[PDB]
């Protein structure tokens, strides 16, 4: 009946598992290039 | 000065003969793609004699279609099946003359009425089932209501007379719609007839097929079995309806004005 | 965590199909590199044509022979 | 298996993909320190 | 020469004038009595564009020109050099295009099907008699129609644009050139459809209908039928045709201002 | 009269179908397939369901940034006034850069936006050309539909992109507007001599003519033999019946010559490529060959010469 | 850092070889008529810079050509 | 190795079809000519028009003969 | 085994591929050597 | 693939690869005409 | 009927982490508002 | 693959070698014709 998407209790904790560790490894070098850039051009 | 000129040669001009070399290449191209149905011509010669002669361009090589299913090759052009047995007497001594039908005109298969020979076996869904079907051995079938289900009206024959009733309906799975409707006429046989010939009108209940008249639906073809229908068979039901447009009426052949 | 978070990684490949993704690359990284190229054209920092290290299409205009012979018309 | 590929087929994959990977990006650097030396942007 | 099916549908019959005395074939053509017709009206008319290029200045192809009448000779007769021989060779036209049509419907009754394709060709008939004979009477002169001529014709299309300042916003033009695009894409998408499905990739069986709906489901979430996009085309360039018709009729009868002016019934409604 | 086919008088339902089945690896179909009743008078009814992979997810989030950028332009320029927006919308448009930028990156307000929503555009219709040759392609089909799509996305980046950077301008191309693209087309005639003596231009007026011709043609005579089972084509291709012979009969007394059942969807593709194909070539040599269109007729002897019996005195020469 | 490409050669296991070939030769060509026009427009063109001489000046200014064009 | 690495090399045609690659191969060639041939004759390079070793058109224009008839109109 | 190439026959392609690739480089490199000596942009 | 041999493809390499050379020397030399009447760079 | 398939048990669930996660998004909204009022007030 | 047999190919390509050449001889002629009328380089 419901939609589901064949992935039981232990993939998904799986994919979760790197899912959030990708995502801040992603946010933290966005930090990064912000830091350089406003030390090289501030905007504000 | 308005319109001096430095130089006759150009870009343009010469991308202008490009573009007339490249056309008059693609028709060369298409031209021989034309005649992979249909070819060797025959041409009639002084006394009679007809011989085959291929037009300008030439005949492509033959390619070949696989047909799904084990359904066989084709190869095109190739061979063909043989006419049937049409009789047929020239009006009047000239390789271009016109053709009269010698029997009954109906019963003929000449004229709009001729068919083609097409294998004996069915048209085949993506799944290997028969393609057109009556609606009880598609359970799955059903008429849309807003409108009129004609199983149960009369099929009024072009003179006014009837027909018989509708009994079937006819569909097809691959593109849900519909093709035939089944009747049963005067003498108690189980017709066809093509679902582009028919006007139907709900309130009168009525189904009017201008091609042929009343008593001719005794003479319709005939299936062999009931649960389908082969390529055969459409030809030749859909060709007997089609002789009517000039055979129904010993009138109907005969300059209008 | 934080030093061993990323070991599934390699199970990447048991979702994602790896030949779609090598042509996917392949296509965005060309397309990137025209892009970036042109974009670099279009400013100050353009290197074809800012006569660097000599304009040569000024320096065929002032050919002595092409000199001699617009001279002579 | 949404791919067919196994654990150990996909290991094998993602060890030269991330070879392959880190050559590009070394090549990339390569390029950039010639261009900051010719003709500094920033 | 005959194809080789073709002799059991050679029969007499199915005609309108004449009978049984046009009633053959000459080569691979079919004549009838509109037959004849047709090729008398074409080669008069030919050979009166070329005498008329001949009492020209010049009998280079791209530069011959018949010109109508003045607008002062109103709805009259024009004198040969002046204009009479455009009434005779328009004269000439309209006969050879009718005779084209009537013809194409004695065929049709012979081989027992439908009257669609000269009932289509219909509707270009109209749009030129639009040009030459309903919008000249309303208007008030035959010197209001364009003339023969390759690249002659053209200059009367320009300067007739340019009589309303800016044609682009007739409303009409705008509704004509979205059925004549639409219909150039339809007819790209329904070609290379059939040609894929009969055509697949190497080493592989000629597909199927569902194939077909298939496709387009994917790509669009829609798909119109194999008999439908026959019926869409039909009325595309049905449309594209009546169109043109009726953007000819609204300029210069029905609207004398420029183009751009009408529109502003649209910003001028009290309701915004 | 006789019924004429053009729409249907009994319609019949049954359960939806999901499609022919993808190669393994593939993701789902999205969506609930439903029907229309109006859309069954005249074709197919099922509306869904719809296949959204990698190539047509990127295409639809440019095309949707484009879009959302070319439509709060055109709301800037009356003030974000939705009244005004819609009372005057035909006039309104996303203008190019001022030609004198050339082909540098100009500010936001000055032809920025213009420059964003181009590319934005292009991007889209690169990531749908990919999409629509992957779906003919897995199917197991001839990929004859992603030829003439490349030649349509050629057309619209000749005038656009690669005719304004090879004349030096990003000012020389169209504006996002319905009146202001009008605006466009007369003044780019106008400004090289007139169009009409452009022999591209009137080839490509030529197959568009054609076109017409054709599809009109080929619709009727698929309707007059439907009555023959005409209109399933791929059985009278792979199994020639009554309705192909009728056809190709009819064409052949009354012009001479004739097609096949096979043959004529190849005359359909070509007459539809070749409009683009001189509509590329007419566009690319305007301004950069060629100045004045009119005084190259006249110089390669094709344009008429009407008598004059008058002179007029040219004021710059006085 | 040696032995990390061992296993290349198992590409062509997953990648049609006659396939990426003809891709590569054609994009080649491609790349090679695009940069040869893009250096053409640029103040590096080599067929229109009159280096070492300019012809159709050349030409103009023969004894034989301009002893005719005195003549009229 | 440098010399042997060509080896096999031949086996080239065991998957790719000769004749459609010689029919492509001498279709390109003689497409690439006609380009070649109408780039050059665009350019200062141009052997047609240049007039050397002699313009013709201007040698008509200035024949004793025709110079002549020009006088006596 | 999805392009139906062994190991073997794919060790072998791709022998003659790293070849071809390396003297296709090689023919670049030269021309661009004689550019420079010509024709210098930098 | 294509139904060659292995001595059928030796046979077609041995003689498209003398083609080829006679073709580029024939190219080689018309580059020199061209240059002793009409040098370009 | 029209009907999701979740039981009750289900729908509580969903229901508790949407709200939370909803919760968690206005505040950093909020927090967002107040630095650009403190940078450049617009009001 | 051509239905030609070896013998068939090489009669065929006798006479095709003869007419080429031919072919090429009448071109050169026309060639040295024309420059000696009008000399274009
Ligand atoms: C004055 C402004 C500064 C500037 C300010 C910033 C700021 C601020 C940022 C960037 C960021 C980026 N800049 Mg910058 N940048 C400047 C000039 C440039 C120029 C140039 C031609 O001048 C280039 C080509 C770049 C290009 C880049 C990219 C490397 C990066 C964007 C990543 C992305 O698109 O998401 C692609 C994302 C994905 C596909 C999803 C997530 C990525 C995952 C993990 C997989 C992708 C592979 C890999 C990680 C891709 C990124 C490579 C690096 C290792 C990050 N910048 C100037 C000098 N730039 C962003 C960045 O650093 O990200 C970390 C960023 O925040
Ligand atoms: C002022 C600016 C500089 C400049 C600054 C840069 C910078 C910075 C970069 C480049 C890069 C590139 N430049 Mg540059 N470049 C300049 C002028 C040019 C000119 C020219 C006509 O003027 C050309 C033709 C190039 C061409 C190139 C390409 C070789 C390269 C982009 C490759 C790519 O897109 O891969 C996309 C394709 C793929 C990823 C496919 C995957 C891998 C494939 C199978 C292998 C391809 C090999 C690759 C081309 C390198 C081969 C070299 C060998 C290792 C010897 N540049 C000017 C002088 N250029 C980039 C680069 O070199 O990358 C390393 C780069 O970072
Ligand atoms: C400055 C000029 C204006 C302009 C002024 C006009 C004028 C004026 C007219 C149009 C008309 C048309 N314009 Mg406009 N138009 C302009 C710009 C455009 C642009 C564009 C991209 O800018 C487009 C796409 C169009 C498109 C169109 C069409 C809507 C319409 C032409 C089709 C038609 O008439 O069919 C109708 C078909 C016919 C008339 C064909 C007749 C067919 C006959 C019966 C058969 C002949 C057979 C032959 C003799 C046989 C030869 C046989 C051989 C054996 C082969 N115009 C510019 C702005 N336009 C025309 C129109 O609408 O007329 C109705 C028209 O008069
Ligand atoms: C100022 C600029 C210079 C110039 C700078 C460069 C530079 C730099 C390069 C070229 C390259 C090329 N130049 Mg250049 N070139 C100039 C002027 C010309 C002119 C002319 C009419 O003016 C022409 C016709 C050429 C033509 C050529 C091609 C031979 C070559 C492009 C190959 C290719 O497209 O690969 C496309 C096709 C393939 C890759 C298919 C793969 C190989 C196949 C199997 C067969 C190819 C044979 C190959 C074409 C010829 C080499 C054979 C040798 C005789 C051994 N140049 C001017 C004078 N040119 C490129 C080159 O030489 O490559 C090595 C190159 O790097
Ligand atoms: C300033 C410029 C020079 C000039 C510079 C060059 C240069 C440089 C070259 C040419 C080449 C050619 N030039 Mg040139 N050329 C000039 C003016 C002309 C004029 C003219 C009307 O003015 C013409 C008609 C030609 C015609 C030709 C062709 C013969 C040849 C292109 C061949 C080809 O495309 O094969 C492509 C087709 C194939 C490969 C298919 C297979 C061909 C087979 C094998 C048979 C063809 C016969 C062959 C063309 C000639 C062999 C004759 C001998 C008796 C063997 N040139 C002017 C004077 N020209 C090219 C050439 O000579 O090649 C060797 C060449 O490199
Ligand atoms: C003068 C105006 C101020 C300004 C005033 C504001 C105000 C006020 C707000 C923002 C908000 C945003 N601004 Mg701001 N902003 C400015 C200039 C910028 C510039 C720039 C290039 O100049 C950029 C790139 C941004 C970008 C952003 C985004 C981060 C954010 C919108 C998020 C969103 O749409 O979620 C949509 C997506 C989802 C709901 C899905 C779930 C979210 C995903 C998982 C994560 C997205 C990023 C996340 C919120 C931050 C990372 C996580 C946290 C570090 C824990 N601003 C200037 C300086 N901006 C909004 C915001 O931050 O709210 C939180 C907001 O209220
Ligand atoms: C300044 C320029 C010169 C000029 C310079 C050249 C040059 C140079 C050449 C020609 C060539 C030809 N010229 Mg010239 N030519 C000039 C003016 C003319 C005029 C005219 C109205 O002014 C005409 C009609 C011609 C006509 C011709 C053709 C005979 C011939 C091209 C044949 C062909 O296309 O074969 C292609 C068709 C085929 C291969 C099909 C098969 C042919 C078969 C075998 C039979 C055809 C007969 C053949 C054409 C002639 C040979 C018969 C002999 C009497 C034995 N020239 C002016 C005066 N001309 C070419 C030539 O002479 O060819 C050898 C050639 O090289
Ligand atoms: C069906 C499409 C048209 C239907 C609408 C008709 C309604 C109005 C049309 C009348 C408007 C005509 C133009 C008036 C202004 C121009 C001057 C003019 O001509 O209007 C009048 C003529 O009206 C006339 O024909 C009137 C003739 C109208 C007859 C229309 C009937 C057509 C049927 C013919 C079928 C065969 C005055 O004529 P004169 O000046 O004496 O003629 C002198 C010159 O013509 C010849 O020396
Ligand atoms: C750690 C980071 C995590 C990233 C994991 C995801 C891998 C990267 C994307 C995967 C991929 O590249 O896949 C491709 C998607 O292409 C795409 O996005 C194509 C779009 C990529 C570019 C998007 C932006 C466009 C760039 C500019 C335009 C390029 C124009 C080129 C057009 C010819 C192909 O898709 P599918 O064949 O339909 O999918 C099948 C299976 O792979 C998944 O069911
Ligand atoms: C209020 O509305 C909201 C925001 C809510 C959304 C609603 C959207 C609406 C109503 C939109 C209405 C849109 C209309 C009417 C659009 C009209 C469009 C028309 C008719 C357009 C016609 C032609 C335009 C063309 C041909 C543009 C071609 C542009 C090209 C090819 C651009 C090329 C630029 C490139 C590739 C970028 C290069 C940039 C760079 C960085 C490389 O430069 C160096
Ligand atoms: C020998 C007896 C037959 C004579 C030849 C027939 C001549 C036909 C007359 C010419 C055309 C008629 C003019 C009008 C035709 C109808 C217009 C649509
Ligand atoms: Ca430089
Ligand atoms: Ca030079
Ligand atoms: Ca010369
Ligand atoms: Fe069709
Ligand atoms: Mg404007």
Same mark, same amino acid.
Request: hydrophobic share 50%.
């Given at each position: 009946?419901?939609?589901?998407?064949?992935?039981?209790?232990?993939?998904?904790?799986?994919?979760?598992?790197?899912?959030?560790?990708?995502?801040?490894?992603?946010?933290?070098?966005?930090?990064?290039?912000?830091?350089?850039?406003?030390?090289?051009?501030?905007?504000? | 000065?308005?319109?001096?000129?430095?130089?006759?040669?150009?870009?343009?001009?010469?991308?202008?003969?490009?573009?007339?070399?490249?056309?008059?290449?693609?028709?060369?191209?298409?031209?021989?793609?034309?005649?992979?149905?249909?070819?060797?011509?025959?041409?009639?010669?002084?006394?009679?004699?007809?011989?085959?002669?291929?037009?300008?361009?030439?005949?492509?090589?033959?390619?070949?279609?696989?047909?799904?299913? +084990?359904?066989?090759? /084709?190869?095109? &052009?190739?061979?063909?099946?043989?006419?049937?047995?049409? #009789?047929? *007497?020239?009006?009047? @001594?000239?390789?271009?003359?016109?053709?009269?039908?010698?029997?009954?005109?109906?019963?003929?298969?000449?004229?709009?009425?001729?068919?083609?020979?097409?294998?004996?076996?069915?048209?085949?869904?993506?799944?290997?089932?028969?393609?057109?079907?009556?609606?009880?051995?598609?359970?799955?079938?059903?008429?849309?209501?807003?409108?009129?289900?004609?199983?149960?009206?009369?099929?009024?024959?072009?003179?006014?007379?009837?027909?018989?009733?509708?009994?079937?309906?006819?569909?097809?799975?691959?593109?849900?719609?519909?093709?035939?409707?089944?009747?049963?006429?005067? +003498?108690?046989?189980? /017709?066809?007839? &093509?679902?582009?010939?028919?006007?139907?009108?709900?309130? #009168?209940? *009525?189904?009017?097929? @201008?091609?042929?008249?009343?008593?001719?639906?005794?003479?319709?073809?005939?299936?062999?079995?009931?649960?389908?229908?082969?390529?055969?068979?459409?030809?030749?039901?859909?060709?007997?309806?089609?002789?009517?447009?000039?055979?129904?009426?010993?009138?109907?052949?005969?300059?209008?004005? | 965590?934080?030093?061993?978070?990323?070991?599934?990684?390699?199970?990447?490949?048991?979702?994602?199909?790896?030949?779609?993704?090598?042509?996917?690359?392949?296509?965005?990284?060309?397309?990137?590199?025209?892009?970036?190229?042109?974009?670099?054209?279009?400013?100050?920092?353009?290197?074809?044509?800012?006569?660097?290290?000599?304009?040569?299409?000024?320096?065929?205009?002032?050919?002595?022979?092409?000199?001699?012979?617009?001279?002579?018309? | 298996?949404?791919?067919?590929?196994?654990?150990?087929?996909?290991?094998?994959?993602?060890?030269?993909?991330?070879?392959?990977?880190?050559?590009?990006?070394?090549?990339?650097?390569?390029?950039?320190?010639?261009?900051?030396?010719?003709?500094?942007?920033? | 020469?005959?194809?080789?099916?073709?002799?059991?549908?050679?029969?007499?019959?199915?005609?309108?004038?004449?009978?049984?005395?046009?009633?053959?074939?000459?080569?691979?053509?079919?004549?009838?009595?509109?037959?004849?017709?047709?090729?008398?009206?074409?080669?008069?008319?030919?050979?009166?564009?070329?005498?008329?290029?001949?009492?020209?200045?010049?009998?280079?192809?791209?530069?011959?020109?018949?010109?109508?009448?003045?607008?002062?000779?109103?709805?009259?007769?024009?004198?040969?050099?002046?204009?009479?021989?455009?009434?005779?060779?328009?004269?000439?036209?309209?006969?050879?295009?009718?005779?084209?049509?009537?013809?194409?419907?004695?065929?049709?009754?012979?081989?027992?099907?439908?009257?669609?394709?000269?009932?289509?060709?219909?509707?270009?008939?109209?749009?030129?008699?639009?040009?030459?004979?309903?919008?000249?009477?309303?208007?008030?002169?035959?010197?209001?129609?364009?003339?023969?001529?390759?690249?002659?014709?053209?200059?009367?299309?320009?300067?007739?644009?340019?009589?309303?300042?800016?044609?682009?916003?007739?409303?009409?033009?705008?509704?004509?050139?979205?059925?004549?695009?639409?219909?150039?894409?339809?007819?790209?998408?329904?070609?290379?459809?059939?040609?894929?499905?009969?055509?697949?990739?190497?080493?592989?069986?000629?597909?199927?209908?569902?194939?077909?709906?298939?496709?387009?489901?994917?790509?669009?979430?829609?798909?119109?039928?194999?008999?439908?996009?026959?019926?869409?085309?039909?009325?595309?360039?049905?449309?594209?045709?009546?169109?043109?018709?009726?953007?000819?009729?609204?300029?210069?009868?029905?609207?004398?201002?420029?183009?751009?002016?009408?529109?502003?019934?649209?910003?001028?409604?009290?309701?915004? | 009269?006789?019924?004429?086919?053009?729409?249907?008088?009994?319609?019949?339902?049954?359960?939806?179908?999901?499609?022919?089945?993808?190669?393994?690896?593939?993701?789902?179909?999205?969506?609930?397939?439903?029907?229309?009743?109006?859309?069954?008078?005249?074709?197919?009814?099922?509306?869904?369901?719809?296949?959204?992979?990698?190539?047509?997810?990127?295409?639809?989030?440019?095309?949707?940034?484009?879009?959302?950028?070319?439509?709060?332009?055109?709301?800037?320029?009356?003030?974000?006034?939705?009244?005004?927006?819609?009372?005057?919308?035909?006039?309104?448009?996303?203008?190019?850069?001022?030609?004198?930028?050339?082909?540098?990156?100009?500010?936001?307000?000055?032809?920025?936006?213009?420059?964003?929503?181009?590319?934005?555009?292009?991007?889209?219709?690169?990531?749908?050309?990919?999409?629509?040759?992957?779906?003919?392609?897995?199917?197991?089909?001839?990929?004859?539909?992603?030829?003439?799509?490349?030649?349509?996305?050629?057309?619209?980046?000749?005038?656009?992109?690669?005719?304004?950077?090879?004349?030096?301008?990003?000012?020389?191309?169209?504006?996002?507007?319905?009146?202001?693209?009008?605006?466009?087309?007369?003044?780019?005639?106008?400004?090289?001599?007139?169009?009409?003596?452009?022999?591209?231009?009137?080839?490509?007026?030529?197959?568009?003519?054609?076109?017409?011709?054709?599809?009109?043609?080929?619709?009727?005579?698929?309707?007059?033999?439907?009555?023959?089972?005409?209109?399933?084509?791929?059985?009278?291709?792979?199994?020639?019946?009554?309705?192909?012979?009728?056809?190709?009969?009819?064409?052949?007394?009354?012009?001479?010559?004739?097609?096949?059942?096979?043959?004529?969807?190849?005359?359909?593709?070509?007459?539809?490529?070749?409009?683009?194909?001189?509509?590329?070539?007419?566009?690319?040599?305007?301004?950069?060959?060629?100045?004045?269109?009119?005084?190259?007729?006249?110089?390669?002897?094709?344009?008429?010469?009407?008598?004059?019996?008058?002179?007029?005195?040219?004021?710059?020469?006085?």
């Amino acid at each position: 009946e419901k939609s589901t998407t064949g992935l039981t209790e232990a993939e998904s904790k799986e994919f979760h598992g790197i899912f959030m560790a990708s995502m801040t490894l992603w946010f933290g070098l966005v930090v990064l290039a912000h830091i350089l850039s406003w030390l090289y051009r501030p905007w504000l | 000065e308005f319109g001096y000129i430095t130089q006759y040669f150009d870009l343009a001009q010469v991308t202008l003969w490009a573009f007339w070399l490249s056309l008059l290449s693609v028709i060369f191209f298409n031209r021989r793609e034309d005649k992979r149905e249909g070819y060797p011509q025959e041409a009639v010669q002084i006394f009679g004699k007809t011989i085959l002669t291929e037009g300008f361009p030439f005949m492509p090589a033959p390619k070949t279609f696989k047909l799904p299913h +084990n359904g066989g090759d /084709v190869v095109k &052009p190739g061979p063909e099946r043989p006419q049937y047995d049409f #009789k047929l *007497e020239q009006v009047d @001594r000239f390789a271009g003359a016109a053709y009269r039908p010698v029997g009954n005109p109906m019963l003929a298969g000449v004229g709009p009425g001729a068919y083609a020979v097409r294998a004996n076996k069915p048209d085949l869904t993506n799944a290997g089932d028969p393609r057109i079907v009556p609606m009880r051995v598609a359970k799955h079938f059903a008429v849309v209501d807003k409108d009129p289900d004609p199983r149960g009206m009369t099929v009024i024959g072009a003179d006014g007379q009837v027909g018989g009733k509708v009994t079937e309906i006819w569909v097809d799975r691959a593109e849900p719609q519909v093709r035939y409707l089944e009747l049963e006429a005067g +003498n108690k046989k189980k /017709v066809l007839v &093509p679902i582009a010939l028919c006007v139907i009108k709900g309130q #009168k209940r *009525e189904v009017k097929v @201008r091609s042929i008249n009343g008593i001719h639906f005794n003479d319709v073809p005939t299936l062999s079995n009931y649960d389908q229908i082969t390529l055969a068979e459409e030809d030749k039901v859909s060709a007997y309806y089609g002789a009517g447009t000039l055979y129904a009426t010993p009138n109907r052949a005969e300059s209008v004005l | 965590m934080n030093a061993k978070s990323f070991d599934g990684m390699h199970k990447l490949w048991m979702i994602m199909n790896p030949v779609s993704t090598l042509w996917a690359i392949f296509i965005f990284q060309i397309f990137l590199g025209l892009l970036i190229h042109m974009v670099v054209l279009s400013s100050d920092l353009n290197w074809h044509d800012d006569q660097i290290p000599v304009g040569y299409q000024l320096q065929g205009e002032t050919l002595p022979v092409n000199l001699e012979m617009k001279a002579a018309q | 298996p949404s791919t067919g590929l196994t654990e150990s087929e996909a290991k094998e994959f993602h060890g030269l993909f991330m070879a392959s990977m880190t050559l590009w990006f070394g090549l990339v650097v390569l390029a950039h320190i010639l261009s900051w030396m010719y003709r500094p942007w920033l | 020469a005959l194809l080789n099916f073709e002799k059991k549908y050679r029969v007499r019959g199915g005609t309108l004038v004449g009978g049984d005395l046009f009633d053959f074939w000459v080569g691979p053509f079919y004549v009838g009595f509109f037959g004849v017709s047709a090729v008398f009206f074409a080669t008069l008319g030919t050979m009166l564009i070329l005498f008329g290029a001949a009492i020209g200045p010049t009998l280079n192809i791209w530069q011959i020109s018949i010109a109508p009448p003045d607008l002062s000779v109103g709805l009259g007769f024009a004198p040969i050099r002046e204009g009479g021989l455009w009434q005779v060779i328009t004269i000439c036209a309209v006969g050879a295009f009718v005779s084209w049509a009537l013809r194409q419907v004695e065929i049709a009754r012979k081989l027992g099907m439908g009257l669609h394709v000269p009932f289509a060709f219909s509707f270009a008939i109209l749009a030129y008699l639009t040009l030459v004979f309903f919008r000249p009477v309303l208007l008030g002169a035959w010197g209001h129609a364009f003339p023969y001529g390759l690249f002659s014709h053209l200059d009367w299309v320009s300067n007739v644009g340019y009589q309303t300042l800016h044609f682009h916003y007739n409303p009409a033009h705008m509704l004509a050139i979205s059925f004549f695009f639409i219909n150039t894409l339809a007819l790209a998408m329904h070609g290379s459809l059939i040609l894929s499905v009969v055509n697949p990739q190497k080493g592989e069986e000629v597909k199927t209908a569902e194939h077909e709906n298939t496709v387009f489901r994917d790509i669009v979430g829609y798909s119109i039928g194999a008999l439908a996009i026959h019926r869409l085309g039909l009325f595309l360039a049905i449309n594209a045709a009546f169109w043109s018709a009726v953007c000819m009729i609204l300029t210069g009868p029905f609207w004398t201002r420029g183009w751009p002016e009408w529109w502003m019934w649209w910003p001028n409604l009290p309701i915004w | 009269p006789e019924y004429q086919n053009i729409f249907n008088k009994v319609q019949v339902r049954e359960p939806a179908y999901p499609g022919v089945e993808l190669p393994k690896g593939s993701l789902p179909r999205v969506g609930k397939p439903i029907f229309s009743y109006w859309l069954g008078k005249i074709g197919d009814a099922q509306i869904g369901p719809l296949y959204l992979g990698g190539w047509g997810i990127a295409s639809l989030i440019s095309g949707f940034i484009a879009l959302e950028v070319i439509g709060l332009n055109m709301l800037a320029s009356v003030g974000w006034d939705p009244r005004l927006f819609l009372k005057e919308f035909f006039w309104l448009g996303l203008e190019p850069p001022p030609p004198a930028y050339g082909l540098s990156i100009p500010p936001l307000a000055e032809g920025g936006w213009w420059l964003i929503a181009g590319l934005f555009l292009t991007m889209s219709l690169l990531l749908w050309w990919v999409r629509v040759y992957k779906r003919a392609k897995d199917l197991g089909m001839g990929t004859h539909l992603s030829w003439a799509f490349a030649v349509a996305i050629l057309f619209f980046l000749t005038l656009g992109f690669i005719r304004p950077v090879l004349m030096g301008s990003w000012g020389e191309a169209p504006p996002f507007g319905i009146f202001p693209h009008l605006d466009w087309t007369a003044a780019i005639s106008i400004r090289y001599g007139n169009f009409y003596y452009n022999p591209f231009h009137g080839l490509s007026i030529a197959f568009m003519y054609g076109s017409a011709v054709l599809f009109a043609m080929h619709g009727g005579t698929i309707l007059a033999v439907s009555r023959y089972g005409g209109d399933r084509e791929i059985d009278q291709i792979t199994d020639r019946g009554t309705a192909a012979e009728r056809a190709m009969l009819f064409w052949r007394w009354c012009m001479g010559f004739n097609a096949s059942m096979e043959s004529i969807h190849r005359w359909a593709w070509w007459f539809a490529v070749f409009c683009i194909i001189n509509s590329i070539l007419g566009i690319i040599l305007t301004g950069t060959v060629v100045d004045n269109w009119y005084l190259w007729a006249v110089k390669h002897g094709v344009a008429p010469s009407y008598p004059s019996e008058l002179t007029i005195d040219n004021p710059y020469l006085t």
